[PDB]
């Protein structure tokens, strides 16, 4: 059971079966089975939807029934990743060829970036240095989550370090995940941005990133004090799932009381001017609601 | 990656991981890990092992995951050479005594053919031949690849010929090589097969064969157009490793779709008849495939 309060000026905007608007200051609801919010009297919270991935909050539409979805929030397929290595000029070129992910001295560093295809699935991408010549590092790439995977023979890309130990060629390609349980692979830019070449010191991986996540189950839902609606996913992620509207008019000693601490527009209170909790006319609500679901 | 998909009646033949048996008529391989050869799915392309020295396809065989393996090629140790000579009967004995490998005047010809031990070194076996009287030559061997072995100094052989040129005896002989490295002798017949003594003419070798090789690394894999699957190695030899199984049913709309264009065997179906492309049931393979290791 949600509870939110306003501070100052405004009434929460809700709606009958039949689509008639009424105002409250109560801010008592509960998620009913159309996951909607829901006053005693059954009627809806409204507010503004979100649309588009990441969801974003549309204040130019039309206020409609405010919606927390149990719905899972999907897997994102990663796009980019990127690792930064720090490399050892002074490194052996391997006497061991070829190179190979099972002899560990055909290469001089392994790295490891863990991503995620369309279904959500991990592929932990072991990425490897061999250093060709002076200056030149071929970098190998495998899928280590593929049960069915291929040995790599032909480098992914070369890195190119200039005098000064600064990548100056060959430091974004495009990589390819296996195909793991039937799911579409997941093709990514993979980035070297900032990697360089230390005149000495030992091969060792500073930072990696990637974009990409699991798919997550709803763990919480909660309304920030300017009324927006956010989950909370198994994930680590979070989703945008709308914007409560907030009502304000020239006399509300017009509106018609409906009973419960609802009230009707009428000729004599004004036309309602909606906002948000705060933004103009209106102050943040006095805390917001967080919810296990 | 191979392609070998299928617009005719058959289907490759698959196993899952746990041995779980599909069928389908894509035929996109790549050669994984495991040394299988796996569609998209990780599903292994199945079909006849090859057994035996020289590995050879059987009709009794149990359909199983083609493995493609990195293993080197065995040497094998010569058991048979060949040497056909054509001697000079009007040739002088020689005066200089005794045979000596050191000594030129001291045989009438020398020649060479090189075998091999079962580790695959080459032993370059010298073959001289030194006229005794008419019609008969005596013949030495000698591995000049053996720094140890002793000096001929006892015929391995006596060529006799008929009135006619025609070799009458003395034609075969087992020789045993010397030793290389620590590695065991190579025994071999020597045959002097089709060798004659022309009326005149200078001594001259025409022809020499063996039946050893040295090991060999796997160069190229292919698939025949009748589903066998060969290696082809870097010793100019080549083995079959197996034999793509084609399946056939009698019902094919009672098949279940597993997705993609894969499918199982059910009640409705009847069970898979099993052949090979180019034979019964099954025309052959559109093309088959060849691909570099």
């Given at each position: 059971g949600l509870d939110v309060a306003i501070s100052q000026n405004g009434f929460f905007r809700l709606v009958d079966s039949n689509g008639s608007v009424f105002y409250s200051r109560n801010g008592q609801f509960k998620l009913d089975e159309n996951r909607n919010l829901v006053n005693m009297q059954g009627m809806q919270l409204t507010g503004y939807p979100a649309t588009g991935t990441p969801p974003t909050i549309q204040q130019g539409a039309n206020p409609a029934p405010i919606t927390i979805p149990n719905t899972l929030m999907a897997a994102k397929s990663t796009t980019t990743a990127s690792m930064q290595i720090n490399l050892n000029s002074t490194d052996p070129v391997p006497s061991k060829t070829p190179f190979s992910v099972s002899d560990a001295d055909s290469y001089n560093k392994k790295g490891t970036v863990t991503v995620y295809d369309s279904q959500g699935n991990a592929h932990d991408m072991n990425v490897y240095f061999v250093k060709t010549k002076d200056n030149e590092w071929a970098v190998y790439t495998h899928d280590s989550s593929d049960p069915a995977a291929t040995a790599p023979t032909t480098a992914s890309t070369t890195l190119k370090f200039n005098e000064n130990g600064i990548?100056?060629?060959?430091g974004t390609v495009n990589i390819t995940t296996g195909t793991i349980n039937g799911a579409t692979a997941a093709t990514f830019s993979l980035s070297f941005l900032n990697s360089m070449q230390q005149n000495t010191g030992a091969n060792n991986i500073v930072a990696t990133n990637q974009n990409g996540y699991k798919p997550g189950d709803l763990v919480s839902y909660q309304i920030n004090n300017d009324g927006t609606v956010v989950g909370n996913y198994s994930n680590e992620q979070e989703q945008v799932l709308g914007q409560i509207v907030l009502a304000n008019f020239a006399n509300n000693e017009g509106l018609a009381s409906q009973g419960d601490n609802v009230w009707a527009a009428t000729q004599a209170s004004g036309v309602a001017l909606l906002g948000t909790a705060g933004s103009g006319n209106f102050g943040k609500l006095t805390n917001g609601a967080l919810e296990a679901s």
């Open positions: 990548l100056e060629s060959g």
